[PDB]
From Swiss-Prot, chain A:
It comes from Saccharomyces cerevisiae (strain ATCC 204508 / S288c) (Baker's yeast). Present with 10300 molecules/cell in log phase SD medium. Early fractionation of eukaryotic MCM proteins yielded a variety of dimeric, trimeric and tetrameric complexes with unclear biological significance. The MCM2-7 hexamer is the proposed physiological active complex. This is Minichromosome maintenance protein 5. Component of the MCM2-7 complex. The complex forms a toroidal hexameric ring with the proposed subunit order MCM2-MCM6-MCM4-MCM7-MCM3-MCM5; loaded onto DNA, forms a head-head double hexamer. Interacts with CSM1. The gene is MCM5. Belongs to the MCM family.
Swiss-Prot record, chain B:
This is DNA replication licensing factor MCM2. Belongs to the MCM family. The gene is MCM2. Signal peptide: none annotated. It is found in: Nucleus.
Amino acid sequence: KSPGDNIDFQTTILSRFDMIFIVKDDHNEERDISIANHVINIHTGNANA
Amino acid sequence: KIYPKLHQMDMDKVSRVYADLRRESISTGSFPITVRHLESILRIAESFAKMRLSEFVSSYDLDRAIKVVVDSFVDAQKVSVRRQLRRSFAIY
């Protein structure tokens, strides 16, 4: 489906916003492993800090 | 008094588990398991270490946290979607 009718609010509200980002989730494992490693580095890994 | 931590030695398994959770979840397609579930696994691992008065989180605490998270996620699914318990996530 289009971005409109896939959203709760009025379609024309999308006109008011300057830039609209569709943050789709990609289920590719390369990205999943990287995100998990990053998020663990966040959680007591103390690497990111 | 007890503020536990983890160490990078226990990164590998957790990442793989997260991936598996994702892939059995989109195959089912009923419930999204996002990065929030990985960060809930981490929190429950910290709690498991806290009840043992430990200052670092052992791999057994991580295993117990993973078991709790996967059991809660599985029991919130449909009977048709519940297969992930019998033959997908039976390893955990």
